[PDB]
Amino acid sequence: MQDAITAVINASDVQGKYLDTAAMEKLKAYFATGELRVRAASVISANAANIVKEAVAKSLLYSDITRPGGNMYTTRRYAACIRDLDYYLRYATYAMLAGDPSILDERVLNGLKETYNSLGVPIAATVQAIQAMKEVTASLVGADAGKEMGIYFDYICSGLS
Amino acid sequence: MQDAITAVINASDVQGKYLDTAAMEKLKAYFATGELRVRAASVISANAANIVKEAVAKSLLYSDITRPGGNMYTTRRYAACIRDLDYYLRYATYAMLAGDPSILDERVLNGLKETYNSLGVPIAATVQAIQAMKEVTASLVGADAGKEMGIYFDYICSGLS
Amino acid sequence: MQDAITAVINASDVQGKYLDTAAMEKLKAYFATGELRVRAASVISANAANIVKEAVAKSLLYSDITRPGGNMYTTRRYAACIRDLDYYLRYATYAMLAGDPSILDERVLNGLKETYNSLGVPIAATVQAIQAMKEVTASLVGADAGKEMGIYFDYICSGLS
Amino acid sequence: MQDAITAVINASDVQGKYLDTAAMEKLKAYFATGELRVRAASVISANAANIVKEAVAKSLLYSDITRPGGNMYTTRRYAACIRDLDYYLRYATYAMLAGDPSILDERVLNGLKETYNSLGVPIAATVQAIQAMKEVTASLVGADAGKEMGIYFDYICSGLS
Amino acid sequence: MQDAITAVINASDVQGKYLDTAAMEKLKAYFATGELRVRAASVISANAANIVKEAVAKSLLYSDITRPGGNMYTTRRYAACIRDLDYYLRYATYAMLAGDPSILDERVLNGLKETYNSLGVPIAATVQAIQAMKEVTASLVGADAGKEMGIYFDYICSGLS
Amino acid sequence: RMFKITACVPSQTRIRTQRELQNTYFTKLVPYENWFREQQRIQKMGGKIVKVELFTGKPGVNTGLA
Amino acid sequence: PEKEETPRFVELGAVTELRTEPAIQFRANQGVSKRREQTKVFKLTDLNDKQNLQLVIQAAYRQVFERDVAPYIVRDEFTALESKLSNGEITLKEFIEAL
Amino acid sequence: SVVTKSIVNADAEARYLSPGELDRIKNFVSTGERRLRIAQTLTENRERIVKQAGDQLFQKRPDVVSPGGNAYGEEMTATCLRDLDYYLRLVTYGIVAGDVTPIEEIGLVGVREMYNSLGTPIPAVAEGIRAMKNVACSLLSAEDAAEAGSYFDFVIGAMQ
Amino acid sequence: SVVTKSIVNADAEARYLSPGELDRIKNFVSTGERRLRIAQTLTENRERIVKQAGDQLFQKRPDVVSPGGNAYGEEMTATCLRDLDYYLRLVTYGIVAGDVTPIEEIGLVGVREMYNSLGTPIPAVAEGIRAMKNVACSLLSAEDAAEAGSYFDFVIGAMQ
Amino acid sequence: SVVTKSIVNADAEARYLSPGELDRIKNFVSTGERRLRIAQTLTENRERIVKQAGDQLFQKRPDVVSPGGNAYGEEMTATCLRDLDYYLRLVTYGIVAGDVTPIEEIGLVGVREMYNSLGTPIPAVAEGIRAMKNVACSLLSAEDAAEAGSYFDFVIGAMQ
Amino acid sequence: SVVTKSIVNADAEARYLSPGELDRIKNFVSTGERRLRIAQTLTENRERIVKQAGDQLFQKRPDVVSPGGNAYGEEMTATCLRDLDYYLRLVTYGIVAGDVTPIEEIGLVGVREMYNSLGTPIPAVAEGIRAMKNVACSLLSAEDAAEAGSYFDFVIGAMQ
Ligand SMILES: *[C@H](C)[C@H]1/C(=C/c2[nH]c(/C=C3N=C(/C=C4\NC(=O)C(CC)=C4C)C(C)=C\3CCC(=O)O)c(CCC(=O)O)c2C)NC(=O)[C@@H]1C
Ligand SMILES: *[C@H](C)[C@H]1/C(=C/c2[nH]c(/C=C3N=C(/C=C4\NC(=O)C(CC)=C4C)C(C)=C\3CCC(=O)O)c(CCC(=O)O)c2C)NC(=O)[C@@H]1C
Ligand SMILES: *[C@H](C)[C@H]1/C(=C/c2[nH]c(/C=C3N=C(/C=C4\NC(=O)C(CC)=C4C)C(C)=C\3CCC(=O)O)c(CCC(=O)O)c2C)NC(=O)[C@@H]1C
Ligand SMILES: *[C@H](C)[C@H]1/C(=C/c2[nH]c(/C=C3N=C(/C=C4\NC(=O)C(CC)=C4C)C(C)=C\3CCC(=O)O)c(CCC(=O)O)c2C)NC(=O)[C@@H]1C
Ligand SMILES: *[C@H](C)[C@H]1/C(=C/c2[nH]c(/C=C3N=C(/C=C4\NC(=O)C(CC)=C4C)C(C)=C\3CCC(=O)O)c(CCC(=O)O)c2C)NC(=O)[C@@H]1C
Ligand SMILES: *[C@H](C)[C@H]1/C(=C/c2[nH]c(/C=C3N=C(/C=C4\NC(=O)C(CC)=C4C)C(C)=C\3CCC(=O)O)c(CCC(=O)O)c2C)NC(=O)[C@@H]1C
Ligand SMILES: *[C@H](C)[C@H]1/C(=C/c2[nH]c(/C=C3N=C(/C=C4\NC(=O)C(CC)=C4C)C(C)=C\3CCC(=O)O)c(CCC(=O)O)c2C)NC(=O)[C@@H]1C
Ligand SMILES: *[C@H](C)[C@H]1/C(=C/c2[nH]c(/C=C3N=C(/C=C4\NC(=O)C(CC)=C4C)C(C)=C\3CCC(=O)O)c(CCC(=O)O)c2C)NC(=O)[C@@H]1C
Ligand SMILES: *[C@H](C)[C@H]1/C(=C/c2[nH]c(/C=C3N=C(/C=C4\NC(=O)C(CC)=C4C)C(C)=C\3CCC(=O)O)c(CCC(=O)O)c2C)NC(=O)[C@@H]1C
């Protein structure tokens, strides 16, 4: 796991130098942006259920996927699908707060490809669903925070695909 | 590559027995059904372009997949997608004529999974497209031949997924 | 794991349909044969050790395999061989009781060929042994039940191949 | 392979938009710096062998690596080392001319770490050598062009790490 | 391939002398006519299809040659004939732009007689046809340019003859 | 025992916009081992075999072949 | 007032997903490798053009031996003269095989 | 089903089916014809059961079909009835299976999570299934009705 | 672009960019401002070019918008104009790139295969792009128009 | 049907079905399975036949769909295509029945009166049915297509 | 001919004909009389097939025979009709041969290049051959007309 600060100091550590003025400038930038990150996290944490609900309705419902034999059909699988969507949103906001995508690659996308292939989950349908999540969450947090949530959502999409 | 006849004689060969009366009954059944297979192949070979056109229109068009950045966007990729659909239909009718799915597994589905994952092709979208092909081709060849084309199309779907 | 009834209702559930008249047919047929299945299971439960005993004697004893350097030699490996035969017979009676071979594939034949190849166990010799079991168990249960046991013993043989 | 202009138009194409004013900005900036890039490329094309010569002398010679048992020892391996440095310098000039690092990633740094680990080549020593090349080439091209060469030499170093 | 500049400097190179003022004069003369050569090339590039069409109609068509048994008969033969005329016109425009007949002499004329005689293609008819091409192209480019082109067309005619 | 050969390769399969004279008419030095295989391939392609010579080697030599 | 609506053709071909750098990096480099069209093919079109002949000889080294052979050879052990301005190995089908 | 449950429980203990289990499956086999008859009646009257039970549900919960309710409008009310239809189908599966395993796995694991994501009220779904149970019992004889009514009872109990 | 083509051709021969190629990219760099200006004009008047060129195309090919034609009806004619819009966008990409590589790869490899699958007439698409070329040239100065008109000419030539 | 044709002819003369009449009935009932298959292909592909034949009709007779024509706008073109669907349905009835009496009773006695009251051009309707015949022949096998083509031919003849 | 193809395959593998390949040529030998009969009726009715099909083609797309069309004027129309006769006798050669190799060699390779050099529209050529196919089908029995139609279909596909 890493942060923007942790990444900066770890890079300087690899070189073996005390924090340079350029490293300090990166750290200062992250500190300047920290308040904006905290605000955005406060917003989507409150609306997490609504974000999942809207995304599911917009892309995953009233289709063959959620009708007999569709992988979202059966209440167990429907619960699992919405649980995965909250997983994605929760880790996306973790990555947004951190300012680093190392969280997503270390946790979310380690073999997630392989699990979904085994389970029979449609990767493309999950990618569509989290794309819808990206649209909703961007609107909630605003444009500048949305383009920060957007990159982490797209990173998850790329890992799935 | 195998046929229904080739599979029957190969099974008897593995046991080391001349063709038993049960083996002869299987062979006789395939001969009885051969004319029906030939008819169905004659039908879809004539309508191969129409089957691909209808399936593409029903599932693959007027969606994000065929609009900028969608994997079917760009004329090169559109040509490749319809070419893959004709590949699937041609091998499906080969398997229908043979009465054996060994053709599909030996040719069509050897690493097709891996190629599509590498290319970035959406497996789910291809499966939807060939499902639409299955509907159109079943209607053309009739119910009894359609349920024979259907199993081979579904075998391709399972290999992709 | 599945049985005949579970398989029928699962197939109907996949196609999103109440139980068909043909599905009701399959259910009736299983119920008609069910009492015969129960009686056969009781018989070979009582004679399980005896069936293994006879089959081992009739193909696996006084042979190059049980003589030194033939894999079945050594008391360890002899115990493992007879235990595997008891496994096969017990899972065959499970499959016969259920009326479905899904148990065999899901719990017995998955990875069994791979393990046997790694261990050095002769897949041909195990197949011969369980065919000997098939003869003995058919004699004990009777002809009608022996047929039913056979379609699952042969299933195990094919998986081993 | 891409360049600055190709990257800008490809990004705009992915988003299905005519060239933005910001995209036009990036294109203008590349054109403003383009003539400087061309002049620098001419300089290090003439002095390519000399740059490799100096860098090899300044970090890779009279050291434990070139003494027996240090990988660079043996005339074969010395020729391979200097050839790799020429590869790195030539691809760095390609990247500088293009204004994009995609060439480095696509043709140089893909699998390079894996091959070096298998061969036993010291990734640290190669990184030190190309940093020496960076100093020499910066002196020859000039300060402005040397910065541009550096952002691609460092890219190669990071890939090697 | 050789051009006016290459011919002048090649003659000086055989002399072993630097560029004389007379050689510079020859280069100046070629530069003087290079302007007209460029626009003539543009004109016949756009009208190349029309030029070949008109020449073929003028001499090749409605003849026993394109009637059965005349060697131009058969669609493949007709396509090859117009392909050769396209070749001749394109090489003629290359020679006209260069101001030198080297391209014709080496790339086209050598071996063409042997291939045509072996295949049975009528060299007299080809010479007549490219003569017709010369007339049409002279009309399109203009008189001065037609003088420039016609010499190369006649050069090809002599090579065929 | 390299064979010097002269041959034609007319092709009806396609009409070629790019240069075809080079492949069409050619002379090549084919070794004795290759000549049967190449002869069969060019004969199958239907090109006329204009000329053959034994560029290297001797017309008949029991041993000491190249 | 003037209505100032968008035309339908704008909406039909507009992607409305707000794609970002990871998505653009992936969606632009989706498909077969770009080295299918970012490559060059060499031909011995004219034995007389010596510049091209040197390029094609070197290219044959690059494909057959996977790298330029100046490292890993004591001396150059290939006579390309039979391929160059001669019919002995005029067939690149023979020069490649000889290598 | 009873057969698959017995096999599972015996496989875990690595024991051939004991006579205590073998008689259980024999009993279920014997009553199979009655079970199939009950399911056949339910599937015959699929559409009547769903239609009139849904009307009863909407009568007892007018808020559900009122504006602002979950099942408001032509298509929304049809999806609500579709869920009732799904549960009837699961009930027929459970009846022929002889246990509640198909009902449980297909439609009662996480039913609350699914319905809360949808915004649907779980108690109102329960009342709809209760109405279906009443209608189905009216279409069955007293012994047949009480045998099937237990599967309905399991469904409503899980809904609560 | 010219830069990427030169780099590709040089990488294959393993040669640093020769001066013959370096001057080519220098020329393209120098005229970049004019190229950007042409593209900026085209993207400004995107909607006018597409609208009136499409009207010209339908005037010259009434069969295309007549009933039974490919682009018949409100949405179908809008997709036809959308294709024209796509080609205009590709043309602007090609203009700033300085070569036809972006146009070729994005929209002219297999254009006939795509359009024949759709059932669309390729020559009519070509005439639509010709109308766009005329309108775009009217919006450019004579030198600017002829520089861009060649990219349009490449597109129509591939369409044929 | 053919059974009705035989029975009507027998009833008129007050005689049990003659052996020849009964022979015809035996042939018809033996051929019934293939008849039902041919009709089933037409019904299953009922949308393709109508859509493609509608396009062919509108191409060949553009006046009906042009403004000022009978089928102008999607509102009225829908009714024209519906009538084409009607006649496909009648043809499937005829294929199953083995006679043109279903077609003639339902939709060929008085077409001249009905369409002349609606204003519709009957020759254009005939073109539409001929287009349906060609499209259906594409879908059907040659031997079967000949049999179905006869019923299509009866319809076009009646409307000429 | 299939005989030619079988020899080519066996020559490629350096094998004498396998019994299956020998059986293929045996079957074609017996089929020869039927194939000759089909070709014989085509040549007997060659004039009638060409004439009415040509008039139908000109009626279909009159721009060909209108001023500005490639076949404007009696001489130009006569030569195009001559081409139609050429292609019909190509199809006769293909019918007796049993494969399309003679048709391809005589008149297909470079079809676009020949007719665009002449300025003739290849889609119009396709419609002309389609008319020839329809007239030929009328003069052939339905069973026989399937065999000749396949060669016609290949030719029109190659025209495109
Ligand atoms: C009806 C008694 C109550 C009610 C329900 C209601 N449900 C939905 C939507 C869905 N219901 C399901 C249910 C299931 N999926 C399953 O796999 C199973 C087990 C077999 C069940 C029961 C699902 C998946 C959906 C999502 C939509 C879809 O199927 O595609 C709605 C629609 C909600 C909306 O606004 O979109 C409603 C209204 N509503 C009521 O008022 C009743 C009390
Ligand atoms: C307009 C000048 C002509 C015309 C065209 C027409 N096209 C379509 C449908 C599609 N067109 C495309 C085109 C492209 N895809 C690409 O990736 C590119 C390169 C950037 C191009 C040019 C595609 C993909 C489609 C499919 C639908 C979709 O985009 O989702 C239609 C609609 C066809 C239909 O009936 O569905 C039409 C009508 N039609 C004309 O009349 C003109 C001559
Ligand atoms: C169409 C339904 C979907 C789609 C496909 C798509 N495929 C490719 C590229 C390739 N596809 C294959 C697959 C096969 N090879 C085979 O031999 C067979 C039959 C046995 C199959 C199915 C391969 C090998 C390739 C790569 C080689 C090639 O160029 O074809 C592409 C990319 C094409 C490109 O990048 O230039 C695409 C887009 N795309 C879709 O959107 C559909 C869902
Ligand atoms: C001996 C004192 C008593 C006795 C023994 C008896 N044994 C057998 C048969 C077998 N015994 C073995 C034993 C071993 N196999 C091993 O690998 C090892 C360790 C190296 C041992 C000890 C085996 C394999 C057999 C099977 C026959 C075979 O070898 O193929 C029998 C025959 C049983 C029969 O009816 O078939 C007997 C009688 N019998 C006595 O009375 C003694 C008390
Ligand atoms: C007897 C007919 C043949 C034979 C058998 C033999 N088997 C093993 C070892 C293993 N067998 C299994 C198989 C199973 N495991 C299971 O759980 C089930 C049911 C679900 C089966 C069928 C496994 C896992 C092993 C390895 C682990 C173990 O020892 O149990 C051996 C031992 C090999 C060794 O040396 O380690 C032998 C000898 N041998 C014969 O000669 C017969 C032909
Ligand atoms: C010698 C007769 C002539 C000569 C040589 C000279 N060599 C160097 C430097 C190096 N030479 C080597 C040689 C080898 N490395 C090997 O692995 C092998 C095979 C086992 C050989 C032969 C190397 C590696 C170097 C680099 C220095 C080092 O070892 O680290 C120099 C020094 C060059 C300089 O300026 O740095 C010289 C002068 N010089 C002569 O005048 C002779 C004609
Ligand atoms: C020099 C700074 C260091 C060093 C290098 C060394 N490298 C190799 C071998 C290989 N290097 C490569 C790398 C590339 N191949 C490429 O095509 C490109 C550009 C796209 C690069 C960067 C490869 C593929 C090899 C292996 C194949 C080959 O021999 O060329 C060696 C040889 C190792 C061996 O013994 O086989 C060496 C010695 N050695 C040093 O000491 C420096 C730190
Ligand atoms: C025909 C339905 C359409 C059409 C054609 C048209 N063709 C020509 C002229 C020629 N056609 C040929 C064709 C062939 N030569 C062959 O060897 C074969 C295969 C055996 C074929 C099919 C040739 C050679 C000519 C050139 C004249 C000649 O024969 O010498 C014309 C005349 C063109 C002119 O202006 O000179 C025309 C009009 N035109 C149509 O409108 C139809 C759609
Ligand atoms: C047209 C004026 C006359 C005619 C021509 C005809 N030519 C060929 C075949 C060939 N022509 C060439 C010539 C060239 N090849 C080249 O690359 C160039 C440019 C440097 C030229 C000039 C060659 C090599 C061939 C043979 C290989 C091939 O097919 O390309 C044919 C075909 C002969 C055949 O049947 O195989 C014909 C008919 N025919 C005429 O009637 C005109 C007088």
UniProtKB/Swiss-Prot annotation, chains A, B, C, D, E:
Gene3D superfamilies: Phycocyanins. It is a peripheral membrane protein. GO terms for biological process: photosynthesis. InterPro entries: Allophycocyanin_b, Globin-like_sf, Phycobilisome_asu/bsu, Phycobilisome_asu/bsu_sf. It is found in: Cellular thylakoid membrane. It comes from the Bacteria. The modification N4-methylasparagine is found at N71. (2R,3E)-phycocyanobilin binds at C81. Contains one covalently linked phycocyanobilin chromophore. GO terms for cellular component: phycobilisome; plasma membrane-derived thylakoid membrane. Light-harvesting photosynthetic bile pigment-protein from the phycobiliprotein complex. Allophycocyanin has a maximum absorption at approximately 650 nanometers. Heterodimer of an alpha and a beta chain. NCBIfam families: apcB (TIGR01337). Belongs to the phycobiliprotein family. This is Allophycocyanin beta chain. It comes from Thermosynechococcus vestitus (strain NIES-2133 / IAM M-273 / BP-1). The lineage of its organism: Bacteria, Bacillati, Cyanobacteriota, Cyanophyceae, Acaryochloridales. The gene is apcB.
UniProtKB/Swiss-Prot annotation, chain F:
It is found in: Cellular thylakoid membrane. Its main location: membrane. GO terms for cellular component: phycobilisome; plasma membrane-derived thylakoid membrane. It is a peripheral membrane protein. The keyword Membrane applies. Belongs to the phycobilisome linker protein family. This is Phycobilisome 7.8 kDa linker polypeptide, allophycocyanin-associated, core. The gene is apcC.
Swiss-Prot record, chains H, I, J, K:
The keyword Transport applies. Contains one covalently linked phycocyanobilin chromophore. GO terms for cellular component: phycobilisome; plasma membrane-derived thylakoid membrane. SUPFAM superfamilies: Globin-like (SSF46458). It is a peripheral membrane protein. Disulfide bonds: none annotated. Belongs to the phycobiliprotein family. This is Allophycocyanin alpha chain.
